[PDB]
Design a protein that fits this description.
Length: about 180
């Protein structure tokens, strides 16, 4: 197994996957690494199993249909993985914790949002459809763009949103377009 966390690329107290070489800190994995279970399979393995059990699940889908899906176990998992994929980028540090807004010439957003809040909301099963999760994720980046205006710092929102969106298309097998 790897000697660094797959998500944050640091060493420390790591839990190893039994079915692939990845390793995780406890609260870097999503959901948090489970107490018992031997063997244990990580989220990457669990997602691969879904695909292998239903190869047709990788045929293209319309985003509008994906968003209206109910958060049953498999969609719950897919959202957990998509969230994990954003945490895997180091630039997620800017969006992880609760932000605050005091900048000359800007007003803070009406509905602040951050990745740890989405993490908790998933953990507490507060989303009933994929749409709920996706709207909150997109809101993180949209609030950032709007607040930072012409500051070049706005680019961090663009960058991390692109990671999100690419992984969304991959995980939920959105029909490729030009
Ligand atoms: Zn980690
Ligand atoms: Zn694994
Ligand atoms: Zn089948």
């Amino acid at each position: 197994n790897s000697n660094i966390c797959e998500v944050c690329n640091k060493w420390g107290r790591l839990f190893c996957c039994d079915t692939c070489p990845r390793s995780f800190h406890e609260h870097c994995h999503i959901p948090s690494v489970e107490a018992n279970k031997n063997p244990w399979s990580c989220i990457f393995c669990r997602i691969k199993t879904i695909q292998e059990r239903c190869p047709e699940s990788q045929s293209g889908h319309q985003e509008s249909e994906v968003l209206m899906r109910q958060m049953l176990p498999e969609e719950q998992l897919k959202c957990e993985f998509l969230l994990l994929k954003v945490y895997c980028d180091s630039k997620s540090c800017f969006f992880a914790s609760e932000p605050y807004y005091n900048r000359e010439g800007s007003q803070g957003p009406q509905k602040p949002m951050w990745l740890n809040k989405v993490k908790t909301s998933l953990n507490e099963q507060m989303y009933t459809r994929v749409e709920g999760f996706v709207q909150d994720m997109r809101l993180i980046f949209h609030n950032h763009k709007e607040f930072y205006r012409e500051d070049k710092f706005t680019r961090l929102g663009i960058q991390v949103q692109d990671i999100f969106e690419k992984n969304f298309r991959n995980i939920f097998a959105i029909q490729e377009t030009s």
